[PDB]
Design a protein around this nucleic acid. Structure first.
Length: 93
DNA sequence: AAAAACACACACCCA
DNA sequence: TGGGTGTGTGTTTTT
């Protein structure tokens, strides 16, 4: 087992919080929570990976859609779906 | 193309 | 309270 953290950065060089996961799929998911505009509106952020020598940058957007179905009580109703658009993960060896 | 990331093995995983 | 498909372990999809 192994766990790589991620440090989300904004746009002006200022970084926000730090994630503690592993899979880029669910990591990029929470990155799109920027809230830039609404549905249609491009955005680009870069989370520095805290573990391996690699830069993480991807485009992502959110769409307000859904409704109270069978989601766990804490987070029901409707949520803006984030689109993990793999821009380019940099490499370093 | 080669590093970087994903496929189910299981069912998990945090406020 | 279970989303949505994680981690784990190998390699696969990525890049």
């Amino acid at each position: 087992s192994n766990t790589r953290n991620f440090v989300l950065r904004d746009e002006d060089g200022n970084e926000h919080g730090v994630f503690t996961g592993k899979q880029p799929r669910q990591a990029a998911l929470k990155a799109a929570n920027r809230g830039s505009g609404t549905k249609a509106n491009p955005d680009i952020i870069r989370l520095r990976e805290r573990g391996t020598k690699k830069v993480h940058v991807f485009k992502a957007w959110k769409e307000i859609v859904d409704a109270p179905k069978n989601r766990p009580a804490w987070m029901p109703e409707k949520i803006s779906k984030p689109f993990v658009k793999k821009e380019r993960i940099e490499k370093l060896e």
